[PDB]
């Protein structure tokens, strides 16, 4: 019942899209480890949307069809706890991630108060969301191609390094 | 009259009332620069460029925002600065002055290209190509394939000088920030 001009007809098309996200993941980490927590988190919610859009556009003829499956004893569960995972999902369903994502890049004045990324995005939330972003990638696209397995070696190494 | 009219007719919700609130923005813009520098140097050109264009509209927004008339209630559509749909919210460029560090670093050619893209709105389109991926005429192009190294290095330089030539001087703080950006501008040109 839904369509897009962004509809993937080729395995190689998916691979290129997978690489694309692979680079963004690397990017959001590099920003995170240089203590750019706000800018990183902007990319993380970009990575989530881009993983949501790829996976959807494989089948197809906010849009967050990237809800990493949470199982107790799972890497994400014991990386951020169910404190954080609860809220990330919440914000995804309501779309408050868009509003969070806005505040990680763009200055803004609300109720005559000047909001900058630096004073809106914590290191904890920035770390959670990247892990979640990497988990969205992995549960939504890793395993569809041989390539995605090779790519996934690299995102597991970031995830580990982040988590521990 | 690039920007000049915006603050004489149009009103915004994004109005800067105090130098501390203008240094936040500056300290904000400083971050984005370093971020965009740091990407570019780890070869994330598309991504660097995405930020670079964002610096240009965040300098522009800050610069206008301190002068433009305040209208609290005004909507988000009907706000020139708040929404980054509006082309007319970049309109705060570097002073084009030949022999300038910019002209002597990238050349006079591309600078029109940028301002033409700036004035035409093609920057916004150039921006979307750095972050997302798109299918055009049943062809999938990805951010790496739309942006060149020499592109992502140009706009950073431009975006720095937009900041420098548009904000530096307004505060004591801005000078101290400017010394930082000056290394990165100069690092990039060599």
- Write the secondary structure of B104-118 as one string of H (helix), E (strand) and C (coil): HHHCHHHHHHHHHHH
Total of domains in chain A: 1
B15 touching A (Cβ < 8 Å): yes
CA-nearest of B71, B78, B118, B70 to B94 is B118
Using the beta-carbon criterion (under 8 Å), do B133 and A20 form an inter-chain contact?
yes
A4 domain-assigned: no
Chain A residues lying within 8 Å of B44, measured CB to CB = 23, 26-27, 30
CA distance linking residue A42 with residue B81, whole number of Å: 20
Residues of chain B positioned with their CB less than 8 A from the CB of A118: 24, 27-28, 31
Domain that holds residue B172: 11-189
Q: Report yes or no on B64 lying in a domain.
A: yes
By what technique were these coordinates determined? X-ray
Residue A56 CA to residue A85 CA, distance in Å, equals 22
Closest CA to B130 of B110, B106, B154: B154
Residues 118-137 of A with CB under 8 A from B: 118-119
Could you tell me the resolution of this structure in angstroms?
A: 2.9
Contact flag A39-B42 (C-beta cutoff 8 Å)? no
Output the six-digit token pair for A54.
Answer: 């790829």
Rounded to whole angstroms, the Cα distance separating B114 from B54 reads 14
How is residue B145 written in tokens?
Answer: 């394939």
Whether A76 maps to a domain, the answer reads: yes
Examine residue B4 and state whether it is found in any structural domain, yes or no: no
- Alpha-carbon distance values, B54 to A138, A155, B6, B28, B48 (Å): 29, 27, 20, 12, 10
Instruction: Say whether residue A5 is in contact with chain B using an 8 A CB cutoff.
Output: yes
Burial class (CB in 10 A: 0-12, 13-18, 19+), A72: exposed
The alpha-carbon gap from A116 to the nearest alpha carbon of chain B, in Å, equals 7
Which burial class, exposed, middle or buried, applies to A110 when counting CB atoms under 10 A from its CB (0-12, 13-18, 19+)?
A: exposed
Q: CA B35 → CA A21, A69, A155, B51, distances in Å?
A: 18, 32, 21, 8
**What dihedral do alpha carbons B85, B86, B91, B92 form, nearest 10°?**
-50
Please answer whether residues B38 and A34 qualify as being in contact, where contact means their C-beta atoms are separated by less than 8 angstroms: yes
Q: Which residue of B has its CA nearest to A108?
A: B14
Which has the closest alpha carbon to A25: A119, A118, A142? Answer: A142
A62 touches chain B (CB under 8 A): no
For residue A5, tell me if it sits in a domain: no
Transcribe B103-158 into DSSP letters: HHHH-HHHHHHHHHHHHHTHHHHHHHHHHS-EEETTEEE-HHHH--HHHHHHHHHH
Q: A113 - beta bridge partners?
A: A110
Q: Is residue B6 part of a domain?
A: no
Inter-residue long-range contacts of B39-42, CB under 8 Å, 24+ positions, other chains counted: B39/A27, B39/A30, B39/A31, B40/B152, B40/B153, B40/B156, B40/B188, B42/A30
Residue B2 lies in a domain: no
Residue B139 dihedral angles phi and psi, to the nearest 5° = -115, 130
Judged by a CB distance cut-off of 8 A, whether residue A140 touches chain B is: no
Q: How far is CA B29 from CA A34, B84, B162, B182, in A?
A: 16, 16, 11, 14
Residue keyed to tokens 């975006």: B159
| Residue A160: how many other CB atoms lie within 10 Å | 11
Q: Is residue A128 part of a domain?
A: yes
A20-59 residues touching B, CB cutoff 8 A = 20, 23-24, 26-27, 30-31, 34, 36, 38-39, 43, 46, 50, 53-54
d(CA A144, CA A7): 16
- Residues with Cβ within 8 Å of A143's Cβ and at least 6 positions away in sequence, in order, are A149
| CB of A84 closer than 8 Å to CB of A74 | no
Q: Which of B86, B25, B42 is nearest to A29 (CA)?
A: B42
Considering only the beta carbons, identify the residue of B24, B131, B144 that sits closest to A116. Answer: B24
**d(C-alpha B64, C-alpha B12), whole Å:** 10
How far is A104 from A106, CA to CA, in rounded Å? 6
DSSP state of A98: H
Q: What does chain B come to in residues?
A: 190
Judge: B58–A116 Cβ closer than 8 Å, yes or no. Answer: no
CB atoms B28 and A112 under 8 Å: no
């Amino acid at each position: 019942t839904k369509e897009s001009k962004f509809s993937l007809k080729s395995t190689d098309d998916l691979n290129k899209c997978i690489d694309h996200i692979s680079v963004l993941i690397k990017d959001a980490y590099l920003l995170y480890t240089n203590e750019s927590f706000a800018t990183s988190t902007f990319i993380s919610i970009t990575i989530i949307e881009e993983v949501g859009k790829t996976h959807i556009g494989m089948f197809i003829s906010h849009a967050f069809g990237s809800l990493p499956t949470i199982k107790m004893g799972g890497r994400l569960n014991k990386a951020i706890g169910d404190e954080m995972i609860d809220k990330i999902v919440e914000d995804a369903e309501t779309g408050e991630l868009i509003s969070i994502r806005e505040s990680s890049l763009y200055a803004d004045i609300i109720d005559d108060i000047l909001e900058v990324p630096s004073e809106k995005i914590s290191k904890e939330q920035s770390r959670a969301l990247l892990l979640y972003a990497i988990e969205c990638f992995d549960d939504s696209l890793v395993g569809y191609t041989h390539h995605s397995f090779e790519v996934s070696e690299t995102t597991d190494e970031l995830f580990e390094k982040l988590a521990n």
